[PDB]
Paper text:
The augmin complex, or homologous to augmin subunits (HAUS) complex, is an eight-subunit protein complex required for building robust mitotic spindles in metazoa. Augmin increases microtubule density within the spindle by recruiting the γ-tubulin ring complex (γ-TuRC) to pre-existing microtubules and nucleating branching microtubules. Current models suggest that augmin binds to pre-existing microtubules within the spindle and recruits the γ-tubulin ring complex (γ-TuRC) via the neural precursor cell expressed developmentally down-regulated protein 1 (NEDD1)7–10. Augmin consists of a V-shaped head representing a functional tetramer of H2/6/7/8 and a tail created by H1/3/4/5.
Residue numbers in the entry:
A (entry chain C): 554 to 603
B (entry chain E): 586 to 633
C (entry chain D): 213 to 318
D (entry chain A): 168 to 223
The structure:
Amino acid sequence: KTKRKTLANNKLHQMEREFYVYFLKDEDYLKDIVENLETQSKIKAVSLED
Amino acid sequence: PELQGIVGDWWEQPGQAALSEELCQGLSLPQWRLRWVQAQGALQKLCS
Amino acid sequence: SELDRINAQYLEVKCGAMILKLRMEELKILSDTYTVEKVEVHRLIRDRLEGAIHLQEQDMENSRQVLNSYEVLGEEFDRLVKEYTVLKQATENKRWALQEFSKVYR
Amino acid sequence: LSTERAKVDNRRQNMDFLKAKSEEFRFGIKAAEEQLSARGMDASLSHQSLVALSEK
């Protein structure tokens, strides 16, 4: 009951649940998601830098 | 103790420790996780 | 006697309850461990490991077949193998020294 | 006798609740069993088989 609650509360662990899922089913999907999040971080960095 | 092992398995190792760099040569899953940690830490620093 | 009979019947009824609760915990953790995506992903892992390893012991089988084909020739060719290994080890010892001296001269 | 009769009467009251909870938990067991059988669980999808294959 502690570990289920911490899994429900933490989205990082719930995305670790799908890291290898998207890495070993269709690696292009995981690559696109990682690149999209990296470009989102870069866009946010540019926006807060201005 | 078998149920304790089953409890441990889901919590930290759902097929994660079954991968290497030779299988799926492009980049291995720990490297993907490290890149995700770096990018998500950058995003969390920018959001805060 | 009736008191002890009811006591043991209560124990018999109650032990199965926690046994089945143990079964529920094991089955529910097994259900939550692998979702719909994870089962197909692990099946693809089985396919990928099979496809890699069927190449791997094929490569080792080919290597062992090559070694056996060399061993068919006889002990004289084994002596030739040892002799050419010694000659090529000395040859690479001279070659590496020559290359190192050429690199030092540059 | 009075003390043991009180104990076995509490246990005989607990008989029905234990049996009803046993039926509910058996239905939960069957629900978890069909949840497992829908995805097709076996030893191949487990951590141990994949780790053993990666190690060999």
